[PDB]
Symmetry: D2
Subunit: 249 residues, 4 copies
């Protein structure tokens, strides 16, 4: 009886309720943001999250993201920065994760992000060590803080436990905390505690997000190379493809 898609009813209720929660928290959600790309399920085997529902507390990789801003910030740049513009830009989005669910392990080669918890608490799992890029020297300034070891008993999604292996550092973020930075090239993932009485709601402020999603299919590229560029590298293969399309029946 393994689910392989989400019904139109389950999708709309999931996304509409989330938008309402976001609006209650004063996030500027416009109509075009509430679309068939907002609800993300990372892989066919993750649709089983809708067997018992988003309030079961079971570990699955699915989440909602409402993108209010994804600006290239290319205008006004000296032409010499053209090849480096993809590392800049401005992206603002509201992320909603239900109890026990995860934004799965992945890293970005160009995108650096920051987190601001609005509601609930955020458990971030990450590698304090950045990845390298064969043949190219990289700059360094602050690097990532080491953080703490994982707490006991973190239930991971079935069949994807090994994907969290390298994300050894842990940090629990709460509303009102200082902004937390996740530098590019660092593996990261996060979940909403399973016992949370509310969905985790976090605002991400980061550099440009290169994601050829369904709701993105059709946009114009500010610079040639950008077109089709996918700056997401999920440890789990099923996650990389799932990210770009949701199966709604």
């Amino acid at each position: 009886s393994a689910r392989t898609s989400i019904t139109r009813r389950e999708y709309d209720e999931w996304v509409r309720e989330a938008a309402a929660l976001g609006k209650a928290l004063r996030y500027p959600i416009t109509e075009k943001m509430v679309n068939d790309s907002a609800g993300i399920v990372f892989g066919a085997d993750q649709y089983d999250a809708f067997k018992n529902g988003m309030w079961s507390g079971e570990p699955y990789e699915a989440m909602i993201i409402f993108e209010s801003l994804n600006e290239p910030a290319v205008d006004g740049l000296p032409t010499g920065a053209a090849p480096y513009a993809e590392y800049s830009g401005l992206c603002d989005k509201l992320m909603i994760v239900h109890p026990g669910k995860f934004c799965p392990p992945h890293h970005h080669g160009r995108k650096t992000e920051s987190y601001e918890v609005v509601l609930g608490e955020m458990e971030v799992f990450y590698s304090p060590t950045p990845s390298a890029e064969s043949g190219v020297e990289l700059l360094n300034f602050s690097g990532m803080p080491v953080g703490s070891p994982w707490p006991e008993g973190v239930a991971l999604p079935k069949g994807r436990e090994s994907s969290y292996e390298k994300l050894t550092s842990y940090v629990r973020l709460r509303a009102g905390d200082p902004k937390f930075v996740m530098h590019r090239k660092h593996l990261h993932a996060f979940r909403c505690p399973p016992d949370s009485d509310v969905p985790l709601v976090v605002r991400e402020v980061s550099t440009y997000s290169h994601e050829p999603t369904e709701a993105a299919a059709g946009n114009h590229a500010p610079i040639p190379s950008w077109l089709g560029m996918h700056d997401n590298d999920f440890v789990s293969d099923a996650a990389n493809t799932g990210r770009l399309q949701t199966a709604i029946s």
Copy 2:
């Protein structure tokens, strides 16, 4: 009786009340953000705003800014982007402007910003035309929208009316509106309507802010050139210096 400074009492009450308002609106204001640099008065002649107070509705150039994030985002960048890093980075801050007061005319050579109104309404004045930079070619993608002509009867600060001359385009932003982008190299200014029952509260999400302020004096520079760099160019000279220091008695 022209004021040339703000008393410790006026400053603390101004800044503390603003922080409380920000907290009520769920902005993550930490203790280090509530400092002697948060309250900005753009020039000695602007201290007269405290003759009748922040609720008089009189046109003066003063505002409060609580910076929660100003990340260089240099880590993980290929060394070749070093000279262009100053155009990137991530800056998040809450800006509070009282009735009739202004964030004065200025432009940034490197910083691109975006606005999200949280409380009240924001009246933005700007030049749809970007400035040029002698000897260097610049990229273009979306440019700035033209906007509308100024509404009738906008009271400008005394002795600084000519500084708003080139900012011919006008746009009134409200809570819930789409994010509004202010590209680098564009002159811009904004105020809270004089008849507003509440201070204007807006969240700015932009690229790195190069501002050698008092509360900034002492930070480490990620890249040599950055040290001491001031990416603010106010049309009014008194505004450029005032920005970097508040006179508290």
Copy 3:
């Protein structure tokens, strides 16, 4: 295929999401408030609201109510007021109504209520004329305002349209409006507009609520007569019984 109950999953998701929305809006929802009595479906034939779900926009009589306060306020009263205490007391609750759904036609003999819209907009239907009580004289002071006629095209629940007949006055309430009073002995009902992007969330502040609900079964009565007293009189019979118990499968 007519539904006659709501599944445990549908109930929990409905109520849990609503509690989260309430919490986001700063309403003090404690654990004991999130129970099997919070989600109300007014009659077996109204369970069909869960055929297409709470976001279908279809007209059904169901709602969520989180009661934070229901205080008798009998302590300190002169004994002579004993027979009149049931008209006083203090009740505070958060009511959540989804698009197109209704809090059905009914009146209270003792309870006077007031409304404060927190999110969305509230459409109130009521009789400006109070009901009488055979054999007893009643006091008068302000009475109810007449209001406006119903707007065109209000979809009512199937088979219950006649129950709204006498509720001729209409008023649409919004967040920030003056408190709206619904005097006891006045027929009233309300819904969330079908095109609302968010569930209607309203805070009711009223006198004591005499409702022998399931989650109420077991409380102590401050005064003999109060025990078992049901101060709700729904025009629709199915509504009176449904109110006191939800069928969860």
Copy 4:
């Protein structure tokens, strides 16, 4: 240099900022609520609170109250309840108390209240023992909980320390806590902790408030006796009169 009044500027800034804070927290504050009666200073000697200001942390008895509802709830009552109506009714208001300031010791003969902390934390001081009323028997049901002893080092207003003597029970309330009931005939007072980074903001939901205030001078009485009735009994005489009028210069 002892202050004996508050300047128009100090008053407006105090009240306007508070209204903005209330609005940010979604309390329905209308224009008529922002008047010359909202800011309360309990006695001529308490105006010294404005010597160093509302952010000094000094112990003074002053506060802001925005009343959104004060409904007699007399309509629909059987005539026999006329003499007991004054114990009922509905009153909703937002109370704002700055760091270290107090809502001074007092009790009500008819009014029962409840508290809901919206921002900050509330320290309530009260007598678990109700007062008696010569010649009249009173009802009892739940009475007041005993609470805890006062914490160490509570700074009381100068020259009014003895007024807090009988208020031996203490309870610290926070946002999200269960509603707290203060039965009529119980002495009570409260303050915002002196080290609070934000003003204390609390919503009071109670029975009718009989207060012949300045902004009240002119209202119609639903029942003869009510006219001019003052249901406030402050332990400090200067507090009883101060409550009804603010000296603005």
